[PDB]
Amino acid sequence: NTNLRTKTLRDGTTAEELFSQDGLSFNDFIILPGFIDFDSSKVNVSGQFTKNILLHLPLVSSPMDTVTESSMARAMALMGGIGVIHNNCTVEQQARMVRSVKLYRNGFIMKPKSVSPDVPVSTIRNIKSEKGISGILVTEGGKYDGKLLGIVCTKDIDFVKDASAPVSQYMTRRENMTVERYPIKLEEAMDVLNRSRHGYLPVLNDKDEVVCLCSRRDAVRARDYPNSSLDRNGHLLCAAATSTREADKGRVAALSEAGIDVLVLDSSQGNTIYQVSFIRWVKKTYPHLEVVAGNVVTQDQAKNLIDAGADSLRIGMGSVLACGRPQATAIYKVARYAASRGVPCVADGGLRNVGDVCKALAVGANVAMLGSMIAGTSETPGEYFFKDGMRLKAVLDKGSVLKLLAYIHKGLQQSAQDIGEVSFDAIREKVYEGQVLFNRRSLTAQS
Amino acid sequence: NTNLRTKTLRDGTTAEELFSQDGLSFNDFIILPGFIDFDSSKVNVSGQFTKNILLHLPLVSSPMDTVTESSMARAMALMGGIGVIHNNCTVEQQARMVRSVKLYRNGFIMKPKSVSPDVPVSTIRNIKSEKGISGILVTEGGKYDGKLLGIVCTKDIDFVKDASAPVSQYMTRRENMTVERYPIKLEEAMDVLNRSRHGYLPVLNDKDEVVCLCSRRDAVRARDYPNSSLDRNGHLLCAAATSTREADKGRVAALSEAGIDVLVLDSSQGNTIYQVSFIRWVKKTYPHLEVVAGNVVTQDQAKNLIDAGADSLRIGMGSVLACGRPQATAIYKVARYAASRGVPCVADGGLRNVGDVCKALAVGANVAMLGSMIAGTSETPGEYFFKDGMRLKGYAVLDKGSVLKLLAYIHKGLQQSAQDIGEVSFDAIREKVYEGQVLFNRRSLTAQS
Amino acid sequence: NTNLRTKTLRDGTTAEELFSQDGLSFNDFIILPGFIDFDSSKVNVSGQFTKNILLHLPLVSSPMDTVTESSMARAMALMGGIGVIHNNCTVEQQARMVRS
Ligand SMILES: Nc1ncnc2c1ncn2[C@@H]1O[C@H](COP(=O)(O)OP(=O)(O)OP(=O)(O)O)[C@@H](O)[C@H]1O
């Protein structure tokens, strides 16, 4: 239906004209509708977080100590986005959070949590309550590669009152265990696990030592979250923030060991000599890492940071107070310039509802960073408390971040539908082409 | 430490003097502190819901269609309180909600949900998704008492791609199942279940027909909720509301069949001839049922409804109609009169924070009814939605999260208040209030800032 | 680092264009960021109060009778600025404040 979808009258204003005068926020303009011949279910909202990482869900959790720790990053990656673990912590704590995110979901679990036979049941209960993993292997000397002696699961210890008893008293013992022998393809191993009606399947060598471990929970997670952002080994994608000082070099190394796939530079004004040097050093020393430089708001800053070797750009400054730029103009300008050079952009700031996120993605941003919009969800750091009959964490309880991410997803889909394009890549292309049009709204026209 | 706890100077105002003038609400007065020689954890907040039903947690969910359905009543019963299933529904819907509450927790599971071998996996998934029960028995002709053929659990069908496949293809077959033979004591059966590391244990006769079923989930529910309000058969307590018209008689019967333990009469002004007749008829026809009459706010009304045979009274009227009464005065007066006659009372209305609940319990109410305070928790009826960057509930209110966390918060608050007052139980607080050893101070309008 | 500091794309609006239309207050505009290769400690904020007087601190206390007398002028001069003693007084009082 290209004859019906193609605008020839072009009654409206193109992005280039809209952003050619004064700096705009998202309320200053609206997107005009197009032609619909599809359901909102079929809309692809995906966007590039970096040159090589495509997110099924163009949403990134902001690296604030009040928003993104291991739990938030896990939720984001599971729903098809990603989270940036904040850097307001020691290097070891940040690496531990990254490791939690990366080893939450696996195919073969290579370093399965293991204990020695004399460990008390209390310790396994602590592991399950704190780290949330069951099917703890009991091996010679507790080494994750030692001889397999048994396994401890939920129903093996849920009835015992003496929490100091050794696991050897209640574990399922090796002689009675369904196991597999190295080597084995993940497909066959997991189908065997399914047929076995058990929750775990260790994989051992010829010496009965633990090679790895398969978990039914990973299969069920794959079934319940088919769009999770994953690496090539089946782990959830994870990003981590860092400043560009010389000390932070150490930090970077640690994160690289923990397995981050994206490094995000933390700066209000990223067009500095220190950030340029840092990006060069990161791309040289850890080529496998992708770097999101920023923050920037003008095309000059973007030119410098892209020349340095940035894989993506963080847009935002102001969304004492004498330096910055209205956020919608910043996004349009920087994202257009960066796209001309093949670099996607992240919108960071002033994104307070679904209409704003949609506008920010339409005017050039590939993905959007969420801070306030997801603050107070169950997955954020912090403790809940009651006050005035409201439950707060301060901000009000917004429940699960997963339900909110699904809400934002449906909102973006319906908006793209009304605009008349079945994907946001198409929306951005047609915006640059002048086939998706806008209207600036007078101040009165805003209600 | 009776020398230190016993007030002889008695610097303060007794409840009788406090409520002797104009009608008061809860902000008009404060409770004076006493003597502390115990930690707040050791405080017993329990109160009588009726002549025969004691609640470890003196909280009742209000029978409003926006507050109490099966899920809320279950949560309340589990935390040591109770819920009243609302009556803004058909008799069949109310009985179904009551059944949901009553059969959630069991010892021996009677009439275990079972299916025939040709049933598709889709049906088992539907059972798990709607009603929330696993371990479906597969029997001769699907009869809950037929010959046992197998069992279908979570891990038996979580991997299957053809939801139309028969359960017999993936069920665990009877020859491989750990089972027990009638008769068996629940204690031995549950220890067997524990040792077996399985989730379910059927109990069969000599013909391999299903007699009953034990669920490990019940053991874990008992472990995680040790204070659950239970009847004598191990089921959660459940209450249900009804009006006092002639038609509602039918309703009562149905609810009685569903297994309610308390009937609650719904009326803004319960001192009527219709309610008196209804209470007489209920106590006559269903002696096993306990009735909470109301609503009332004066000792006249309380006399009539207790003479009718009420086992408890709901206090509250007004918390444009010109008739009602300030809630704290109403509670004190009616609860004092009813206690003189051996009947506990429920405070219903104007309860908006924990201090008000503590005050209402101290001045005579045995338990407190919560409506607004718990509306918008996850367990209430209604659908969640996002609006203006806020999570709300609709058929609007703000999301308060889990009602369980809220109930625990109220529990800790009541305990700390009782500690500051200097008594280790709320029965003690009520007794000492009537005795003049727990004292109050009326607050001037200025003193409330 | 002149290659990195020098704007060639010039994505933004020059002062001449900004002030070419209607009269603006300070909230009507914002300054765009540039390139950083130094610490804020090294920034020179000095400005000429007059053709021959350079102030290390480009701040002047207003000559209002509620703001600037001898003490304020002293504080300003000491911190690198200057103060203007108000003229809502006799000549002798103003001269005495100046002398102080
Ligand atoms: N490979 C195995 N061989 C034999 N028995 C096993 C094996 N793995 C687990 N078990 C036993 O079966 C039961 C495991 O159930 P499961 O793995 O589903 O527990 P979980 O992962 O902790 O979560 P949940 O049981 O609540 O679904 C336990 O009794 C355990 O001892």
Ligand SMILES: Nc1ncnc2c1ncn2[C@@H]1O[C@H](COP(=O)(O)OP(=O)(O)OP(=O)(O)O)[C@@H](O)[C@H]1O
């Ligand atoms: N009495 C029994 N005898 C033999 N097998 C049983 C018995 N009860 C349950 N099973 C089987 O145990 C295996 C694992 O149980 P499954 O995890 O699927 O459900 P569950 O025991 O209720 O625990 P959960 O649903 O939390 O995982 C299933 O194949 C189930 O059919």
Ligand SMILES: Nc1nc2c(ncn2[C@@H]2O[C@H](COP(=O)(O)OP(=O)(O)O)[C@@H](O)[C@H]2O)c(=O)[nH]1
């Ligand atoms: N037994 C078991 N181990 C898991 C599972 N999932 C992940 N693991 C592993 O458990 C380990 C937990 O981290 P660990 O190094 O033991 O603790 P830390 O030193 O405090 O970080 C990780 O190495 C994970 O790979 C599971 O489902 N079962």
Ligand SMILES: Nc1nc2c(ncn2[C@@H]2O[C@H](COP(=O)(O)OP(=O)(O)O)[C@@H](O)[C@H]2O)c(=O)[nH]1
């Ligand atoms: N298989 C199984 N049945 C249960 C369990 N818990 C309760 N039940 C029984 O399952 C039945 C629920 O289905 P049912 O009431 O017969 O259907 P309804 O008439 O439409 O409400 C009840 O008889 C419960 O007693 C459980 O854990 N497993």
